[PDB]
Amino acid sequence: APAVADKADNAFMMICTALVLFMTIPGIALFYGGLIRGKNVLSMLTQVTVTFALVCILWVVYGYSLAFGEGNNFFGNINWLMLKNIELTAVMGSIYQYIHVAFQGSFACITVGLIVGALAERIRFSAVLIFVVVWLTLSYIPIAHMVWGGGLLASHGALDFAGGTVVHINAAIAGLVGAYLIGKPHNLPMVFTGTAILYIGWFGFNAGSAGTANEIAALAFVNTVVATAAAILGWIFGEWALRGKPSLLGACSGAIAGLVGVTPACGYIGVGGALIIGVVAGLAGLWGVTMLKDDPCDVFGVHGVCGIVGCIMTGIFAASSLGGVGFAEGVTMGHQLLVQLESIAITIVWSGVVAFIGYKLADLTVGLRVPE
Amino acid sequence: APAVADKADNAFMMICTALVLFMTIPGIALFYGGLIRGKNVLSMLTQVTVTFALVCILWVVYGYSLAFGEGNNFFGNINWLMLKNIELTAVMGSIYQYIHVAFQGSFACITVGLIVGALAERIRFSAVLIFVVVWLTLSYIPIAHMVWGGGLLASHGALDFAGGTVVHINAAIAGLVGAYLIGKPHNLPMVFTGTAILYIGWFGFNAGSAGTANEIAALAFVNTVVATAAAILGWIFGEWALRGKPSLLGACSGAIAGLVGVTPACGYIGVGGALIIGVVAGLAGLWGVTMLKDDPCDVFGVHGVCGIVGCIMTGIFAASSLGGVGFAEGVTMGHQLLVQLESIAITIVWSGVVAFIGYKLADLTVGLRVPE
Amino acid sequence: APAVADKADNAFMMICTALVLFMTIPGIALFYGGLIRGKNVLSMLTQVTVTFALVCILWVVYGYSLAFGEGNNFFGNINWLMLKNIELTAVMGSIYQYIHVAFQGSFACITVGLIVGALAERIRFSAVLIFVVVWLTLSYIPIAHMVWGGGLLASHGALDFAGGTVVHINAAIAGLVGAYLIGKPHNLPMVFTGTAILYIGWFGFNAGSAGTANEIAALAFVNTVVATAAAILGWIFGEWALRGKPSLLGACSGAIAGLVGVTPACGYIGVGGALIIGVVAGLAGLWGVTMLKDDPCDVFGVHGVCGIVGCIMTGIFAASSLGGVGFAEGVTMGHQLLVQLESIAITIVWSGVVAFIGYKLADLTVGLRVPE
Ligand SMILES: CCCCCCCCCCCC[N+](C)(C)[O-]
Ligand SMILES: CCCCCCCCCCCC[N+](C)(C)[O-]
Ligand SMILES: CCCCCCCCCCCC[N+](C)(C)[O-]
Ligand SMILES: [N]
Ligand SMILES: [N]
Ligand SMILES: [N]
Ligand SMILES: [N]
Ligand SMILES: [N]
Ligand SMILES: [N]
Ligand SMILES: [Xe]
Ligand SMILES: [Xe]
Ligand SMILES: [Xe]
Ligand SMILES: [Xe]
Ligand SMILES: [Xe]
Ligand SMILES: [Xe]
Ligand SMILES: [Xe]
Ligand SMILES: [Xe]
Ligand SMILES: [Xe]
Ligand SMILES: [Xe]
Ligand SMILES: [Xe]
Ligand SMILES: [Xe]
Ligand SMILES: [Xe]
Ligand SMILES: [Xe]
Ligand SMILES: [Xe]
Ligand SMILES: [Xe]
């Protein structure tokens, strides 16, 4: 009767967790390190590393319990503080629950890395730590519960395979609020290296979200290859048409645009949908950083816009008629789309409000703007 | 009756695919980035990234179908365009076929990365895209079909575990033709970093070519460690004897020489053969870049020479008497050697001719030499 | 009757081996590369690469046989020279023995990389090769046999999951002897990149030491996340208190301190113990590099001190009452602690003496100090 762990899924999921951690340490740190002024690199890398450590600790102390424990529509409980009452041999799905703790913790880490990396230039160090505590505890954790922890958005059938809302939109909005409150790249080879590490790690991010080494993991893997490639080509074509030539930063940005766009969709769509989502995301990203430029190192320009596009287009290309795996029983495309839009709107407002509270608390305690 | 996927092999093979993609993004890009003039790095990285995206797309659209579909001795068919008629739960060997699509696509990517990285300095950007289409479609795909897709060379019993011909010789010849038509490293730490990433990813390349996490994967893994180490020592000893001291570029080149040499052999030989092939490859590589120097960043000097040496020596050390896994029934060492040589010759001529056609078509459409 | 390999464990363990190799190539090379004077980087990278190749070869020729073959309390035998008499399908635990050869060889590689990287600046190149042969054969191999090969320390019940003694203390002492005999960082972004690669690879190091993708691997994985995070925070808090501000080098050093401290403990302790060991290790590391500064690039300052702290605290937090997996039957905490201390003392003296012999033999043959 009691579920038994499959060692193939244990192995797959521990390695996928390592790939996701790789996305933060050193992926996103190198990505931002090549974008910001050289004089701010060391401080940014320190803030990414220290806030990464903080997230790891908060996650085990109470974050996992409040995100994935049973509670209400908005948060879980505190019955798994420091993972108490989780037996070592406890199974979640087809893997040991300890591996689920680590895999889901690694997602919290990259989400925070996306914010801290972009704002470390301008925000005070003690203030970023305050902000991380506030926003992780009151925005990442409730939103993760609502989408992946059986809460409000899951109970309405929201489709988000690997975190278009939980990770990308959530962090993009936090970044924009930060930039609004706190008013050329020097090492593009480093930007490219970070981009590449983010790409390789993202296979653990997307495919690992199946929770098992099955055909859905395989689907998500292939769709991640295709969407990324198509968004690179889409971005680069739009750059050739708009600016006359492609650029390395454009190609890297296109890759990220496709990775973000396919994040919510990868486990639900066909390879034809992945190609279309990739092209659209690459072009919407290019448009986002162009026209929509309140954007610290273009957090929203890509993660926000492409996150929204992917979440919406997931409600389309999940349809069996378009090569997807099919909507749930009794769910039309029109209904699913409405659920995707509602989920996007809730994530935007929830993250913005918590982020405003986080930055304001930091500002009233220690001051936000980096000192003298 | 119908084959069932083993989740352990699914997991193994998806992670091996990620390791192979890692070899291109950022492996080979960093390798060449430290070798070429600083003023050409950004353009090379853009060309590697964009042509990588192009290969990914062409592979799914028609490349997989024409390489691994059933057809004739030279190419497959177009029954799997955009992977149509491949059910998601379809099994190939002991893994889902979708994972086979991705794994084999990643090999096409690194093969093209080897060419583009070396020639991006001198070739026009639109011309490289034309060349990639022509050469991928008419050289990589038919040669992959002939060797790994049940075509001409497979039907004669050619031994090539992970692509001495399909990947290394194929691309080396394309590189030389390019250099013939289009007539010191500045960041050796970057060269070393690329080399190291190529090394780690190559375990997915070599061991993943078993298609399963079995004793042949384990054999290929160990032989990859041994051959690489022995070629480093071989190259470095020859450099000490010839130039008076080892160098970092020598040590990295030796590593690549051993990785290339053991590619066709790793799943067929004993560890004693891997040591011998490594030493020979390291020394043949050193000789190749010395005496044979028409060599853009030494594509053939190592990949061509060591590819040929490895393919030949596979026909020797696969013998059971030498610790190998044994030739097929009824096959003597003399016969096997002849088959290896025939396979090498066909790959050289096929790739050269297609490459000449590719570069000439680009030259007549847009012009090959990078503009003003 | 005969053991059968589990493909899930085969896959897990081959990938963990690749992650451990990643720690040396390029992990530890980049770590030291950013620490030492720019003018010595290329020579250090060459020495790390060439000695890495040497270790790989010695391991297969005789090192595996003498470390993990059956012999006496101090070394094995020479019945597995070049892995002869090891059938390809031979099983060790739940994986093919060939994979065990590679996994354990990768540990020898990182241990030597820790020494060579730190001393390459000052030691002659031919002398480091002599030293590596002597110390690998007479210190790493016997100590690995004593702890993990059924020898003296294993037979007394010493707890060392992933090599607090075999790897970290062993190499730290060899480093100090070297520095005693042979009397600011320029690229901190490179130090951070090396640190990050060491971190990701260390999951293969720690979790792979379970030999299987089971709940102990999962435990070791989570404890590695927690201990690393806590040591970062511990180090950084002590730096804030002592120096007034955190630094990037501090944050990276704290990470390494926690990784070292949890190495012997990760598979035996609860997550609460991992947090405590991480904090203590981070602070002991900070103290080590402060007060105890005979320290070439701070080998002992972190690997030695934190290795000792972790080995001792493993004898505490393995207790079931503290969340650990429990001491063996009939073993009190007091007895276990005494065994940990005895194991630490034997490793320190054994490594020091062999290291002195190694450096002296090199000095009498070729001379230790780098020439003119
Ligand atoms: C593919 C046909 C789908 C149409 C389903 C009609 C019923 C639901 C309509 C809800 C409104 C549509 N939408 C996209 C604005 O939310
Ligand atoms: C180890 C004995 C192998 C000798 C087999 C003799 C029959 C085949 C001979 C074919 C010619 C040899 N070769 C290498 C030039 O192709
Ligand atoms: C948690 C209670 C453990 C006490 C066990 C008493 C018997 C063994 C005492 C050996 C001496 C202790 N120590 C730590 C100095 O080795
Ligand atoms: N990300
Ligand atoms: N990003
Ligand atoms: N390669
Ligand atoms: N290469
Ligand atoms: N290490
Ligand atoms: N380290
Ligand atoms: Xe795996
Ligand atoms: Xe964790
Ligand atoms: Xe985590
Ligand atoms: Xe990229
Ligand atoms: Xe993956
Ligand atoms: Xe990419
Ligand atoms: Xe969503
Ligand atoms: Xe990796
Ligand atoms: Xe693909
Ligand atoms: Xe691929
Ligand atoms: Xe290397
Ligand atoms: Xe691998
Ligand atoms: Xe290497
Ligand atoms: Xe071949
Ligand atoms: Xe990996
Ligand atoms: Xe090995």
Ligand SMILES: [Xe]
């Ligand atoms: Xe190894």
Ligand SMILES: [Xe]
């Ligand atoms: Xe890297």
Ligand SMILES: [Xe]
């Ligand atoms: Xe780090």
Ligand SMILES: [Xe]
């Ligand atoms: Xe792992």
Ligand SMILES: [Xe]
């Ligand atoms: Xe870290």
Ligand SMILES: [Xe]
């Ligand atoms: Xe120990």
